[PDB]
Amino acid sequence: SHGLFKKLGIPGPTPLPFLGNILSYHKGFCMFDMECHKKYGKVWGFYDGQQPVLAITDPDMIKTVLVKECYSVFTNRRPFGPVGFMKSAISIAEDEEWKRLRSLLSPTFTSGKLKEMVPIIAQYGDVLVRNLRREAETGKPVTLKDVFGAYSMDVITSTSFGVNIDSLNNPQDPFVENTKKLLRFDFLDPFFLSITVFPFLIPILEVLNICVFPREVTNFLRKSVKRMKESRLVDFLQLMIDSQNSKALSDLELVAQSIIFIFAGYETTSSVLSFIMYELATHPDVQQKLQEEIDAVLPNKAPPTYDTVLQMEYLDMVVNETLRLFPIAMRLERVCKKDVEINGMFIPKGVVVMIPSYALHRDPKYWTEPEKFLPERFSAKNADNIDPYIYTPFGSGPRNCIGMRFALMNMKLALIRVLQNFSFKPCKETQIPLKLSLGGLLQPEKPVVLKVESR
Amino acid sequence: SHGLFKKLGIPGPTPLPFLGNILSYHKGFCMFDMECHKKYGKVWGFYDGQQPVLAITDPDMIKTVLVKECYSVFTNRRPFGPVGFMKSAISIAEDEEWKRLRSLLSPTFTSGKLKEMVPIIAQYGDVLVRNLRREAETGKPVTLKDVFGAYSMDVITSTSFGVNIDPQDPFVENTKKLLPFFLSITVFPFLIPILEVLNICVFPREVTNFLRKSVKRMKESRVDFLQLMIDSQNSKALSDLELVAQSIIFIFAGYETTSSVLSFIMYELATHPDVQQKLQEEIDAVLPNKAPPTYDTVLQMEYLDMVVNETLRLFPIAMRLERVCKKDVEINGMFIPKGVVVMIPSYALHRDPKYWTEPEKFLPERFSAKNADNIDPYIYTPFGSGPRNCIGMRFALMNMKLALIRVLQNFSFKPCKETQIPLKLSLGGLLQPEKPVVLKVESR
Ligand code: HEM
Ligand code: HEM
Ligand SMILES: O=C(CNC(=O)c1cccnc1)N[C@H](CS[C@H](Cc1ccccc1)C(=O)NCCCc1cccnc1)Cc1ccccc1
Ligand SMILES: O=C(CNC(=O)c1cccnc1)N[C@H](CS[C@H](Cc1ccccc1)C(=O)NCCCc1cccnc1)Cc1ccccc1
């Protein structure tokens, strides 16, 4: 297949036999997408082994892939395996199975259901302050991925299942310990390396009961959800139970969706919160102006409500600019299920159309000083000059992030209660500037550590 | 994965791990489908390794799979590999590559193109009589599949290519050795991409080479089956490799399927002299003085059509009809998951006691116009049904009847000492006799 992009006249790095272009992943997804966007321009193609991957940067062509031709052509993501029973996960399901799951899980995050979660989240916002207060009274450094991960785990377990697992910590909580090692995509591990280079090994491992998710971690979550069924005694757990007592969702598919919601609520929320606090500490002018707005909307440390959060404009600018610099998904991918020609470009069946979100968020031909943290890009004065198909931190189209509004509300509800009582400073041991992990997923090399001062 | 039919509540034999129910194939596909038809009923399921196979016998449900939901759900047969360049064959292609090839090769056997083949076939009918005359003047039993196979090869090579090939012809020798270890692919579905990506096939590379370079030799020009594929090639489109893939299918089907059924017909005529004599009296009536058979005189003979239909009932060479359920459906109030191979036991249905009175008996009167109203077109399916039935059903029926007419005008067939009576079917995979069909040929 290594002559496909040579046939279509599409530029790209020369692929090696069998390997393709995976040798260029030594710097990670991001640095590889950045160099390819500069060298080859608006459209380039490479090979993840024998898999041709077409990278597009045109907003109109991105809109056609993500929005217009979603249900008909670009419906599924890249086939990920071996998954085993997790194939029924909404992020992994395909075609009609995903269509049924998306409609089944869409009412989970309506504006009414989200507003019901604010009082529940307000409880753990108080525990977050007291846990930050013990470490604040001492000059001891604070690992923010630990304290934000515990807060995120409590919000996702109570708002989706109505169960309190982390009672003020319990810092050795088993849900965090298992969700931590739930998945570790590292190019170094020849497993995920050989899966991409030689994909015919997937049906071997599937029949061998081999799964990319570890057994002890799946078992802990598989039996916890079975324990989490306490009826007799409307949430993410009730929407699936009610539809189950009416195809329908089996007790194994109901667990598969819970694992996706638990991981996304823990890992993604805690990672972005750590990225936000790093920029607030390295930019004291932004942190002060954000604290001044929070006090103006919530005087005397007033409790945050669903309406006051949507009122804070500068808070939305800080969250959006951090998501621009750090798109945790990095890439958006769709599988071309049939031959099409979008915007005057033929795309064969089976080619993976990829949108480099990290490279587009730092494209100099869009963002003035793209490497700099400037929240003024997202002010209502300048937000008109932002293409929603260039800035896609949550994706776009029918298969975007279903928990986008929940993640935005959960993070903003955390930043408010934290900045109401504390200020953040570097520690010298804080890695400045922040080096990104040259591995698979978007993470810092050294964990983000900061000093916490009370007010 | 062997708990699918247990989940769906569909009965069937208990599968062994990895193997499934393939150990029950020691008797053949036929006897396994018949034992499961009486033991379980209208619907049962088994496992060819890890592949669940659902067997349906309800005519309304058979019609839904073969005819109604063909283009939507039941479009392709069981995936067969490793093939290679034969993946483009019309019998193996899937979805749109099949639809484009089904439309390209459909005009090959129209009522006009078939009527053009009668004078061409009439030439080889005389050589068939002369070669049978040499073995009839001298008392020597005649291997029917050899003498019929040589006639069937010259017919398909001329009606599809116009080339004349005329006892050790390399085409018959190479086409026949497409005839063990398939027990593994039935158990190892994951080893198919191991031989596909590595470019390994099941057909030996030389039965393909001899035909791949023969088509490139017959393509030297300078409208038949070959000309239809050249004119569209000179306009997605068809390549010199896909063009060869279709020629192998037509050559094999025209040689092996025609001769095997003709051998089965003459065995029934020899074991039933009253049927052979009555058939000879009809041929002499429509065609007096051994008149040359034409296109219209063949369709006029009713008893000849009744003899061929009863033989294809007793010996359906396809044995089974199979479709792959491409997506979850609920036909006739029965949920069928995606990936299940819906199978129609044609051999078991052609001998169902709840339909055919005395099914093991050879009675051509089942297909008389008085009684042909009591047969279900979805129970008697010797050529399949629906949009993906036998594309050469009309050519095969005409070619075999033209051979039966030219022979029964001059010879009568009697059993020999070495004639296997009753005929034992091959307990292996395909439908064939154990011992070759040998019959005494007496001239008239
Ligand atoms: C800052 C936080 C988050 C960010 C930036 C983010 C980003 C994304 C992105 C870029 C996608 C892919 C969109 C596409 O391919 O078009 C996605 C998918 C998804 N996200 Fe998130 N996400 C976040 C948090 C969450 C949370 C809290 C949940 C809770 C359930 C969640 C659940 C999902 C699911 C289920 C999908 C798959 C959607 C589908 O297949 O229909 N995410 N997310
Ligand atoms: C007594 C002679 C024959 C019998 C009983 C027979 C029977 C069958 C059957 C049962 C099928 C499958 C139908 C289905 O799956 O629904 C089939 C398919 C087919 N037959 Fe035959 N056949 C005969 C002779 C021939 C001949 C002479 C040709 C010449 C080209 C031929 C070409 C084909 C092809 C190309 C297919 C596959 C068509 C497709 O899948 O779209 N057959 N045949
Ligand atoms: O990662 C590949 C396949 N990629 C390759 O094979 C590959 C290899 C080499 C080079 N390029 C590509 N698919 C994934 C889908 S599968 C993966 C499996 C998984 C991983 C972690 C926990 C649970 C299950 C999954 O469900 N994640 C969603 C978790 C929830 C979440 C996470 C983050 C944000 N919101 C929600 C693409 C993807 C989809 C959505 C968001 C991000 C990425
Ligand atoms: O045989 C399986 C796959 N079966 C399994 O894997 C399996 C294994 C164990 C148990 N059950 C199933 N498919 C085949 C399709 S492929 C096969 C390949 C082949 C073989 C011989 C010569 C050339 C190429 C093929 O093109 N034949 C058609 C020849 C023409 C013809 C022949 C006869 C009558 N008319 C026309 C199902 C089939 C289709 C049509 C008719 C009969 C059967």
Author numbering:
A (entry chain A): 29 to 261, 269 to 281, 288 to 496
B (entry chain B): 29 to 194, 199 to 211, 218 to 260, 269 to 281, 288 to 496
Original paper wording:
The last two compounds in this series, 10a and 10b, had the head-group linked via the most optimal propyl spacer and the end-pyridine attached through a single or double amide bond. To overcome this problem, we used the same strategy and co-crystallized 10a,b with the CYP3A4 variant containing two surface mutations, K421A and K424A. The structures of 10a- and 10b-bound CYP3A4 were determined to 2.4 and 2.7 Å resolution, respectively. In 10b, the end moiety was on a longer tether and inserted further into the substrate channel. This also precluded the optimal π–π stacking with the neighboring Phe213 and Phe215. Moreover, the end-pyridine in 10b was perpendicular, rather than parallel, to the Arg106 guanidine. This diminished the cation–π interactions, but enabled polar interactions with the nearby Asp76 (3.6 Å away). One distinctive feature that provided additional stabilization of the inhibitory complexes with 10a,b was the S–π interaction between the backbone sulfur atom and Phe108 ring (only 3.7 Å away).
Drug-metabolizing CYP3A4 is the most abundant hepatic and intestinal CYP isoform that clears over half of administered pharmaceuticals through oxidation. The 57 kDa protein has a large and malleable active site that can accommodate structurally diverse compounds, sometimes two or more at the same time. In some cases, however, a partial loss of CYP3A4 activity can be beneficial, as it could slow down metabolism of co-administered drugs and increase their blood levels. This pharmacoenhancing (boosting) effect is currently utilized in anti-HIV and anti-HCV therapy, where a potent CYP3A4 inhibitor, ritonavir, or its derivative cobicistat is co-administered with antiviral drugs to prevent their quick metabolism and improve therapeutic efficiency. Based on the spectral and inhibitory properties and the ligand-binding modes, we concluded that coordination to the heme is the driving force for the association of ritonavir-like molecules, with the pyridine moiety identified as the strongest heme-ligating group.
